[PDB]
C-alpha cells in the first residue's frame, strides 16, 4: 500500500447496530461512487459490542460502537460527524466538529457560527435539534432533556433518514437519495458558515467586504459607513420597539442569529437589526431600520424607510451573485448604505448636497424617492 | 450472483451482518440434479 483495511472494517462492522450498519454501508457506497473526499471509520470496543437517576442513565444508554465520518471541503477545512445510537429509544444522534487547517482567529461577533451546539440546526427547514421524532418515545419518557441533548447530540430527522428509520427497521432504499441530498447540504452549510466567518471578521473593522464581481451592483462613491456591528440576543431583539412586525409575522424564532448594524453620516444614525436563520444563502437575512436623524423616523411614521426595507428584503435576488452566493449579506449592507445616501441627499429642504442624477424627485401617491440603481448609465430611478 | 464475485475476489457487504471447491461441487450437484 505504501508502494486490506476494508476487511478489518467489515469484521468490526459485523457488530454494529442495524441503523449504524446501514449508515456505514451507504456511506462507503457514496464515498466510492461519487465523492472521494469522504472517510468513514468505526470507534468503539468490540468486547462491549459482543455483550431513580440510574433509570435515567440506563434509559439514555449510548451504544459502545459509534460511527465517525469526515468530509474535507475546498477551504482546507474538515467537518467531523460522530453518529451515536440509543438502543432503548431507537434513535440515533450526531455530534459535529468543524476544524480548519489554520489557527482560525475568530472575531467577537462570530460566536455561534461554528459553535458545535448549533451548526447543523436547520439543514431542512425547521427540525430545531430539540424534540424527539417518534411519539412512542414521548409516551415512554412520559412514563418516567436539553442538557442530555448537549451531552449526547441532536436527534434530527435527516440523521434518522440516513439511518433508515421511518417515523410517520432500517432500509437502504430510504437511505439512498437522502444520502446524496444531505451530503450536498452539509457541503454547502460548512462553506456558508466559513464565508460568514470571513465576512464578520472583515465587518468588525468597519469595512464592508465587496468582491470584484459585485461592483456593478453599486455606485462608485459612497459616503455612509458602518461603525458598529454587534451581535445581540433574542430577548434583546424583542425589546426593540421597531421590530414588532418580524416577531408578529413569525420570523423571530429562537433558532436565529440577531445582529445590530449602525450606519452613520453627519449627525445621521441608522440602526439596522438583522435576523439570520441558519439556512443562509438560501433564505436571506431580514432587516429592520430605525433612523434617528431628526426626531425618530421609523417604519411606522415614514414610508421611505419601508421602501428601503422593501429594496433590501424583498428584492434580495438582485444581490445574489454566482452559484456559491455567500456574499449576500455584504451586498445587502452596501445597498443599504447607498440607500441611506439617497435618502439623505434627495430630501427636500441643507447639510447634505444632492449629487445624484435622479431627474425626478418624487412620483406616485406616496411621494416615493428613487431607490433603483442603473449601472450602464449610472443613475437612480424609481422601483 | 454473489458466489461469482466471491470467486472473483471481490468482497461486498451483505445486507444483514476453500470457496472454489465448494462452488464447483455445488455446480456438479446442480447439473446432475437437473439432468435427473
Amino acid at each position: 500500500e505504501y508502494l486490506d483495511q476494508a476487511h478489518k472494517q467489515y469484521e468490526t462492522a459485523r457488530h454494529l447496530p442495524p441503523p449504524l450498519y446501514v449508515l456505514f454501508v451507504q456511506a462507503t457506497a457514496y464515498g466510492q461512487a461519487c465523492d472521494k473526499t469522504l472517510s468513514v471509520a468505526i470507534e468503539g470496543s468490540v468486547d462491549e459490542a459482543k455483550a431513580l437517576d440510574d433509570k435515567r442513565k440506563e434509559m439514555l444508554k449510548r451504544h459502545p460502537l459509534s460511527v465517525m465520518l469526515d468530509l474535507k471541503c475546498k477551504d482546507d477545512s474538515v467537518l467531523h460527524l460522530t453518529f451515536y445510537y440509543l438502543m432503548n429509544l431507537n434513535i440515533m444522534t450526531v455530534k459535529a466538529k468543524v476544524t480548519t487547517a489554520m489557527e482560525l482567529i475568530t472575531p467577537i461577533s462570530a460566536g455561534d457560527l461554528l459553535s458545535p451546539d448549533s451548526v447543523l440546526s436547520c439543514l431542512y427547514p425547521g427540525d430545531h435539534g430539540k424534540k424527539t421524532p417518534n411519539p412512542a418515545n414521548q409516551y415512554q419518557f412520559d412514563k418516567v432533556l436539553s442538557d442530555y441533548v448537549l451531552e449526547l447530540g441532536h436527534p434530527y430527522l435527516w440523521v434518522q433518514k440516513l439511518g433508515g428509520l421511518h417515523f410517520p427497521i432500517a432500509d437502504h432504499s430510504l437511505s439512498a437519495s437522502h444520502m446524496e441530498t444531505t451530503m450536498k447540504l452539509l457541503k454547502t452549510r460548512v462553506q456558508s458558515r466559513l464565508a460568514l466567518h470571513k465576512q464578520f471578521a472583515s465587518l468588525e473593522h468597519g469595512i464592508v467586504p465587496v468582491t470584484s464581481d459585485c461592483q456593478y451592483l453599486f455606485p462608485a462613491k459612497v459616503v455612509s459607513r458602518l461603525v458598529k456591528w454587534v451581535t445581540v440576543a433574542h430577548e434583546d431583539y424583542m425589546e426593540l420597539h421597531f421590530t414588532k412586525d418580524i416577531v408578529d409575522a413569525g420570523l423571530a424564532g429562537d433558532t436565529n442569529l440577531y445582529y445590530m448594524a449602525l450606519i452613520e453620516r453627519g449627525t445621521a444614525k441608522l440602526q439596522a437589526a438583522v435576523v439570520l436563520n441558519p439556512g443562509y444563502s438560501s433564505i436571506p437575512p431580514v432587516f429592520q431600520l430605525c433612523l434617528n436623524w431628526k426626531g425618530e423616523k421609523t417604519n411606522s411614521n415614514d414610508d421611505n424607510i419601508r421602501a428601503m426595507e422593501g429594496e433590501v428584503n424583498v428584492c434580495y435576488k438582485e444581490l445574489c451573485g454566482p452559484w456559491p452566493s455567500h456574499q449576500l449579506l455584504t451586498n445587502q449592507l452596501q445597498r443599504l448604505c447607498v440607500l441611506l445616501d439617497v435618502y439623505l441627499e434627495t430630501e427636500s429642504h441643507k447639510e447634505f448636497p444632492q449629487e445624484k442624477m435622479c431627474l425626478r424627485l418624487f412620483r406616485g401617491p406616496s411621494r416615493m424617492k428613487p431607490f433603483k440603481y442603473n449601472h450602464p448609465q449610472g443613475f437612480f430611478s424609481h422601483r | 450472483y454473489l458466489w461469482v464475485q466471491k470467486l472473483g475476489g471481490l468482497h461486498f457487504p451483505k445486507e444483514q451482518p476453500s470457496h472454489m471447491e465448494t462452488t464447483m461441487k455445488l455446480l456438479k450437484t446442480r447439473v446432475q440434479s437437473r439432468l435427473a
Partner: peptide, 28 residues
C-alpha cells in the same frame, strides 16, 4: 505503454498475492 503494462502486471501480481493471503486467512 510498455511501462504501463509492466506496472499493471505488477499491480495484478500484488492483487493476486493479496487474494492468496486472504484465501490463506480464510482457510486457517
Amino acid at each position: 505503454e510498455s511501462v504501463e503494462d509492466k506496472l499493471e502486471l505488477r499491480r495484478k501480481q500484488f492483487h493476486v498475492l493479496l487474494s492468496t493471503i486472504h484465501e490463506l486467512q480464510q482457510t486457517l
